[PDB]
């Protein structure tokens, strides 16, 4: 074996720690991608959940106004049932006035 | 007719007057339960609908909690990358000062 043999052994031994230390690039250059991928998906994943949520608040917001118009319902029945009591009270005068006719 | 036939007959159009009167106080009485029931109803619809958007965000919490983990791959593949390739040079230098001994 050679001077150059010797040489050769020995950057065939390189060139295996190499194509280790290469391959390794390729799994980290693959796993860069596979996170780039994925970071998009959820990206996007709440975008689609900030839309939801938007959905959800109009939602309860129209409930909100329905409760509104029942709240004001109710107060209308009160007026109304004062008013009413007060013709009930106006009658009864009027007809103890009459009796006493 | 006598004078208390008149009187018999103008407190009979009263008491009808009255009975009306008294017929509007029931409705109005019966309008204020149903605005109250229904005001009820959609309190809680809104409770509802306020536990159904904190779970809504929680949920979002969580895609973004993923997010904040596929970040953190991102960064440790690049860094991963970068070591992968230094090591490739260093044993780039190593074969061409082997091959000139």
Redesign the interface.
Known sequence: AGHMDA?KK??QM??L??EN??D??E???A??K???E??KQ??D??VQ??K??RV??D??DQ??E??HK??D??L???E??A???S??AS??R??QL??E?
């Open positions: 040489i020995k950057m390189l060139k720690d190499k230390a290469l390794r690039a799994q980290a250059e796993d860069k596979a996170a780039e994925r970071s959820l990206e994943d709440i959940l900030e939801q949520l959800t608040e939602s309860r409930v909100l329905e409760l029942s709240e319902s109710l209308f029945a009160e109304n049932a008013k009413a009591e013709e009930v009658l009864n009027r007809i009459v009796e006719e």
